[PDB]
Amino acid sequence: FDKNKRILKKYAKMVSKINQIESDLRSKKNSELIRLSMVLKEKVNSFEDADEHLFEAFALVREAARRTLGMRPFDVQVMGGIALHEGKVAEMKTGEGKTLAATMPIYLNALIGKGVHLVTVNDYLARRDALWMGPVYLFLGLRVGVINSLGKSYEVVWKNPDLARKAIEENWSVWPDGFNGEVLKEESMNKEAVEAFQVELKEITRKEAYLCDVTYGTNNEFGFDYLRDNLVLDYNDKVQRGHFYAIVDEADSVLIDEARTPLIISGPSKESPSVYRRFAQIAKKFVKDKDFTVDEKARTIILTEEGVAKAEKIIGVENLYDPGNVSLLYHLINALKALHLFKKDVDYVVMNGEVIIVDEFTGRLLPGRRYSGGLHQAIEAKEGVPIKEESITYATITFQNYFRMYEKLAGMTGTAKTEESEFVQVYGMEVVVIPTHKPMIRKDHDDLVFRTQKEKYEKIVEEIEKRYKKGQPVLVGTTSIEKSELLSSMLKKKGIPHQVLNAKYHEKEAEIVAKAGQKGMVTIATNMAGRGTDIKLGPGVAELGGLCIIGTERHESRRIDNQLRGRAGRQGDPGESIFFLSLEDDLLRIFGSEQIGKVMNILKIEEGQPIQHPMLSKLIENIQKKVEGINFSIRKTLMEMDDVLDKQRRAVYSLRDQILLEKDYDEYLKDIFEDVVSTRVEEFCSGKNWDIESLKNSLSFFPAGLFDLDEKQFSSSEELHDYLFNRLWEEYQRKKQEIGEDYRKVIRFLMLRIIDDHWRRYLEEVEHVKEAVQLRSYGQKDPIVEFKKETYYMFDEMMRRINDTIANYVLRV
Ligand SMILES: Nc1ncnc2c1ncn2[C@@H]1O[C@H](COP(=O)(O)OP(=O)(O)O)[C@@H](O)[C@H]1O
Ligand SMILES: [Mg+2]
Numbered sequence: 001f002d003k004n005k006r007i008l009k010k011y012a013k014m015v016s017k018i019n020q021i022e023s024d025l026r027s028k029k030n031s032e033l034i035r036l037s038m039v040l041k042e043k044v045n046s047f048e049d050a051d052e053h054l055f056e057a058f059a060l061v062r063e064a065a066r067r068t069l070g071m072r073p074f075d076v077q078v079m080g081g082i083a084l085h086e087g088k089v090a091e092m093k094t095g096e097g098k099t100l101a102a103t104m105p106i107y108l109n110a111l112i113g114k115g116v117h118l119v120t121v122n123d124y125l126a127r128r129d130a131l132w133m134g135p136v137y138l139f140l141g142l143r144v145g146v147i148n149s150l151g152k153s154y155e156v157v158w159k160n161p162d163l164a165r166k167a168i169e170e171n172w173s174v175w176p177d178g179f180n181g182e183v184l185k186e187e188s189m190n191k192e193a194v195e196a197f198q199v200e201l202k203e204i205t206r207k208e209a210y211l212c213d214v215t216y217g218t219n220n221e222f223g224f225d226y227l228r229d230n231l232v233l234d235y236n237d238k239v240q241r242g243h244f245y246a247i248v249d250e251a252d253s254v255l256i257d258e259a260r261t262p263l264i265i266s267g268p269s270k271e272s273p274s275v276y277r278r279f280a281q282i283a284k285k286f287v288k289d290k291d292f293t294v295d296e297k298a299r300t301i302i303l304t305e306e307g308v309a310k311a312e313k314i315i316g317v318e319n320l321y322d323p324g325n326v327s328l329l330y331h332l333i334n335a336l337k338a339l340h341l342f343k344k345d346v347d348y349v350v351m352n353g354e355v356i357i358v359d360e361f362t363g364r365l366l367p368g369r370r371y372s373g374g375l376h377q378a379i380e381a382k383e384g385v386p387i388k389e390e391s392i393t394y395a396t397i398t399f400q401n402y403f404r405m406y407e408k409l410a411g412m413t414g415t416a417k418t419e420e421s422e423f424v425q426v427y428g429m430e431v432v433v434i435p436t437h438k439p440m441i442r443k444d445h446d447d448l449v450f451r452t453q454k455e456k457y458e459k460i461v462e463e464i465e466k467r468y469k470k471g472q473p474v475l476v477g478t479t480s481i482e483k484s485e486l487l488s489s490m491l492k493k494k495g496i497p498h499q500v501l502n503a504k505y506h507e508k509e510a511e512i513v514a515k516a517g518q519k520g521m522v523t524i525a526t527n528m529a530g531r532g533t534d535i536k537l538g539p540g541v542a543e544l545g546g547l548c549i550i551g552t553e554r555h556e557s558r559r560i561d562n563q564l565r566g567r568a569g570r571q572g573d574p575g576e577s578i579f580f581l582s583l584e585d586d587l588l589r590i591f592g593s594e595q596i597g598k599v600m601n602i603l604k605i606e607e608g609q610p611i612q613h614p615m616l617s618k619l620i621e622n623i624q625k626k627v628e629g630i631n632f633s634i635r636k637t638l639m640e641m642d643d644v645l646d647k648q649r650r651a652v653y654s655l656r657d658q659i660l661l662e663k664d665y666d667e668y669l670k671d672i673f674e675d676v677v678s679t680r681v682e683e684f685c686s687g688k689n690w691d692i693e694s695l696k697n698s699l700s701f702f703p704a705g706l707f708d709l710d711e712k713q714f715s716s717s718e719e720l721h722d723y724l725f726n727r728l729w730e731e732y733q734r735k736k737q738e739i740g741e742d743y744r745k746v747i748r749f750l751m752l753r754i755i756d757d758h759w760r761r762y763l764e765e766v767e768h769v770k771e772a773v774q775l776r777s778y779g780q781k782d783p784i785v786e787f788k789k790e791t792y793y794m795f796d797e798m799m800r801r802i803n804d805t806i807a808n809y810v811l812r813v
Pocket of ligand 1: 070071072073074077092093094095096097098099100182183532533534
């Protein structure tokens, strides 16, 4: 059946019922309305409870909006609101009222007391939307938070707290009593009340911005907060309170487009080359097999008791294995290993002062990149010259995997339907195409395809001239600054005044509004500049045919084109739209230039002119649609792999969180201590095996001696396990005794260190394998199976190394 019809049919009924309420509430006094919000706040405490009072809630919001901003939400805006509350992507054409529309569901689900996240694309839109919708929220007793870069969090407050109360106390409104239109007039609204409900920004802390009933921010910042939140050493330095309900504004932009590059926290090379080189020779003095042992089984180097001492005396620090000197320790291992374990031409080469190697000879030209963990820098230090800046990665996550954390996800755009597949396969969200408020009368012309770019751009500038002379305003869309700068040359060599836009949003939206709509105004916008800022038509301009959209080229995704296009018709406004193409454009270059090119020659054309026909326009659509196909498939494979990683990341973070919150590590240590002994017992001394020389060889990292193994009188493997563990756990207790109660903290710190360390090194390593599988999977274990299985082995090793590193640190300190 038709989902969009059934769903919509239901919404209609609902919106209808919300209308009957209005007559009950429009009569109420400002204090009565606030009292109702209070009753609702205590009545609505879960999702079940939210749908119960959704009628009352949505209606109340409407009124507060009619009295607070002068805007009375349209039926459609109430429709979209519901589609948000239901965890779907409400497709509402641009200039429809999404901002306001979102206010109703936001308010409703915000009464649960777990917070509500509104994500946009940038700072402006985050800050702007807040201040713009703030009064309504404040009026109903909600605290509105806002999160921007760099270290910026604010709280929308009344501009004149005293003045707002007069307006509530007394029954002030912006919308005069008795007006019964769908739209108030800027000319006729009680300025006494507009000025009363003015809102401004108040600098607050990050943590607090989230403790607000709702939180407005950028997709970037919400995610960054989460990653940072997993770099803490105190569960109290977190600035988030879980992930409850998030409405993603500009869904297609955040959840698909901005979402293809994974969110990263990159830093700079911590240590200096001076120290590497200083360790490059500190490492030439450690006598192999005395101060340490290498068992590249392969492949690690592990010190002995003579080596910990040399270094300690040498460095010289009281304790090598202590919380402060781990950097030192760590540095020593890289330098000690580099030349004692990578040799020379096995398989790296120093040619031209650059080290490069292997890869089993496909060939050694992996330049390709440097080794993980700062080992590479250690090699150059060894070879003589010279060390290069490295960039460490502390945390990563993709947007898909992030917004997936939220209990209820929701989004809204004017461009969602064409990509329903994606919202459903990635975020599990349906698209509900909300009808427009007023009829949509914008004339979308068939595309103009030219032979050559020169001809494309030359005939584009004729259009600008031709429409400018007429008085009709023009918004020209480009895809690079390069292309925007070029147009600007052309335009001014024929003396045509105009505005160019790219990326400083607070300012650009400022003119985008006055500029596109106002008579005889030309504006060039790069990459959807002035996004989200509504363009109102100027006086006399509607008769001219309204704003005229020019696409300098079609994008690889019809979405992006419909984003520029939707900018013109508006609320049944008149507007025009045309896309220029050339057989040399990338999209065309990618597909059908020649198939088109020939039809061009065959027909009476081409004169230096363009070919235009519905069937061609339609052809471009299919071709452009097919180019999206191949992308999404490609992209989805990457996604699957990203997910495979994400699952590990969760386990780690979830653990990190527990370590953060555990005051007693008695049980956790037992789990580590046992896994330390169990694995070494089950492989060396079990089934057909009873090799001990090798057992204590593997456990040699610990301080000799818990090494009282040579008095061997083991009857069975269970005795050995239980025993090995004993001397381990006894030591732990013997050590709980002296450090006293400051020990829980010391451990905690060490655990986080080790786990972060290994996590960051793991990720670096994993990347190589990601690419390894990607390129070499052909032809072809579904790349995921290779990756899932290979990534597994690696993670399993990481857990082993973490345990040994943890078990070993708590005992030596
Ligand atoms: N309910 C309403 N009543 C009157 N005007 C509205 C209403 N909703 C939106 N507008 C007008 O539309 C413009 C805002 O559109 P916007 O909410 O930014 O669209 P979208 O959210 O689809 O991008 C504003 O200039 C505002 O004057
Ligand atoms: Mg918007």
